[PDB]
Amino acid sequence: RSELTIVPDFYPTMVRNFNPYLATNLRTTTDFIYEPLVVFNEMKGNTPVFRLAESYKMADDLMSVTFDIRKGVKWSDGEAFTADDVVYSFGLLKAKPELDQRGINKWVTSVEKVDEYKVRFRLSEANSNVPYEISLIPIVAEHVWKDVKDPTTFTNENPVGTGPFTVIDTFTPQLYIQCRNPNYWDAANLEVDCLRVPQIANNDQLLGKIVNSELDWTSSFVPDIDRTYAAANPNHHYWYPAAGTQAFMVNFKNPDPAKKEALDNVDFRRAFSMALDRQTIIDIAFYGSGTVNDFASGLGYAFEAWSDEATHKKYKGFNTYDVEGSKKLLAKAGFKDVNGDGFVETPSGKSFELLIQSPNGWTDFNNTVQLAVEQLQEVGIKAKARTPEFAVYNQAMLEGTYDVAYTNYFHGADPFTYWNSGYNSALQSGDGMPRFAMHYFTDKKLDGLLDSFYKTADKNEQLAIAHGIQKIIAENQVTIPVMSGAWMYQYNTTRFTGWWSEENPKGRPSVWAGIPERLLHVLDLKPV
Ligand SMILES: CC(=O)N[C@@H]1[C@@H](O)[C@H](O[C@@H]2O[C@H](CO)[C@@H](O[C@@H]3O[C@H](CO)[C@@H](O)[C@H](O)[C@H]3NC(C)=O)[C@H](O)[C@H]2NC(C)=O)[C@@H](CO)O[C@H]1O
Ligand SMILES: [Mg+2]
């Protein structure tokens, strides 16, 4: 049998959890076990690729959508995939909203079975983007989950799935192997037999394995990639197409009064931003991979057509390396060194040191923070790097105990993915929410604009809304955007061919969970 060795995530040890609704799951659950109704190819104009649904139809008023389910699709246990599974899954997320990690509940009023192969979503608001938003919600088997006592703690260790790889062939603390669904509806197009998923804890362990040609499909940071990895074997390849924003997020609800006095001050956030040398961060921490992001709104240069250039220009100076301007702004805001240590105190005279966190083992981000600490010191801002394990880093954001965090964001075909995930205050509440909105800045007007972005399909209307969003975020310097990154992706031709690449650029090539196109990609791979 052919085994494809993949690394969608690092772990200290393999914990058997295939619940697609829990933040604690394994990152081969979505797509590979639970196939979507539709996969949107974001790189190719956000085009739908129909999988378990064969079609959808939005109502004229954009307030409802029906999906026609493909006939003849089976769960891995042999039972039919039907509208009942879609109705059940959305009903579960309404009953247990802690499982609604994307906040779909607010947008979907009801999900009803029309017949065995047709489901109707009634929406709470007109929403031209709802097919995409629905496409991300995992669909589980009603005939299994109806008998689950507590879906919020169920580890789903024996998953029944619709996707290509549902058989748990091997499971050990150091390795699991996920083999092909024997009843897979699209078996005729699937040539890979199993996913081999070794336990790897961090970038340093990853580097040894990747250089030694032990892996097939990864999306890791690899330092000095041309020298360490690409030159090590003629079969070692990579393709890094452009992706989304990375930024320092500041906690507006910090529990320390001196830190809150700094972090909550827009002039301080701007001075912090002007202390940073974004191009040096890119050159040193990312080995040159990335583009400076000097948009106070975080928009980035790839989305310039969505940008109000007057807004970009008005705030760009606060997002440009400018030590002189940073120091002048600190002084003008009243942040002065009143105790002779070379570090500013708050305007009320309090000392403070900002703890800047990034996830342990994400060495590109760790090195970014170290550079930022040195750059902040030059303007008199005292800071220290912290590298908690991801779960602790994430919990500190969900609990509001962090000071500053370096993070990336997901990245869609338009700016809404970044702006909504990064700023909608509705995404700040929920045990299964991700970290991206957890700065605790809130603005009802901003939320209203985000919630209105797709109320029409009119591009001119969406543009005016985008300009309003850009203005609010920029004028509040909510975060400190640093760069636009890349979809890191490395592939090995030793054991498989058919990979996406710059020469074969079929979609986002990442193996990370949250990139639904990885299902389409795996179906193109052919064993050697
Ligand atoms: C429950 C669930 O599915 N969560 C998904 C997230 O796992 C996923 O976030 C991305 O996760 C990967 C793996 O942890 C991150 O990759 C790491 O990135 C750092 C920083 O560049 C790099 O140093 C590491 O090498 C790299 N690790 C690996 C194993 O490749 C990635 O940065 C995360 N991206 C974001 C925006 O958070 C998200 C995103 O795909 O989807 C969730 O569903
Ligand atoms: Mg001082």
Residue numbers in the entry: 1 to 528
Task: Reproduce text from the manuscript describing this model.
Periplasmic solute-binding proteins (SBPs) specific for chitooligosaccharides, (GlcNAc)n (n = 2, 3, 4, 5 and 6), are involved in the uptake of chitinous nutrients and the negative control of chitin signal transduction in Vibrios. Here we propose three-domain mechanism of the (GlcNAc)n translocation based on experiments using a recombinant VcCBP, SBP specific for (GlcNAc)n from Vibrio cholerae. X-ray crystal structures of unliganded or (GlcNAc)3-liganded VcCBP solved at 1.2–1.6 Å revealed three distinct domains, the Upper1, Upper2 and Lower domains for this protein. Based on the crystal structures and molecular dynamics simulation, we here propose that the three domains, Upper1, Upper2, and Lower domains, which correspond to domains I, II, and III, respectively, are required to explain the translocation process of (GlcNAc)2 by CBP.
The closed structure of (GlcNAc)3-liganded VcCBP was also solved at 1.22 Å resolution. Compared with the unliganded structure, the angle of closure between Upper1 and Lower domains of the (GlcNAc)3-liganded structure was found to be 54.7°. In the (GlcNAc)3-liganded VcCBP, the electron density of the Site3 GlcNAc was lower than those of the two GlcNAc residues at Site1 and Site2, and the occupancy of Site3 GlcNAc was set at 0.5. Two conformers of the Phe410 side chain were observed near the Site3 GlcNAc, and the individual occupancies of the side chain were also set at 0.5. It is most likely that the mobility of the Site3 GlcNAc is much higher than that of the other GlcNAc residues and that the Phe410 side chain flips alternatively back and forth in the liganded structure. Furthermore, B-factor values of the individual GlcNAc residues were 9.86, 12.67 and 16.28 Å2, respectively, indicating the higher mobility of the Site3 GlcNAc. Here, in (GlcNAc)3-liganded VcCBP we observed the side chain of the corresponding phenylalanine residue (Phe410) at both positions with individual occupancies of 0.5, indicating a significant flipping of the Phe410 side chain. The coordinated motions of the phenylalanyl side chain and the Site3 GlcNAc suggested that Phe410 may be involved in the translocation of bound (GlcNAc)2 from Site1/Site2 to Site3/Site4. The loosening of the interaction at Site3/Site4 may be caused by the higher mobility of the Upper2/Lower interface observed in the (GlcNAc)3-liganded structure.
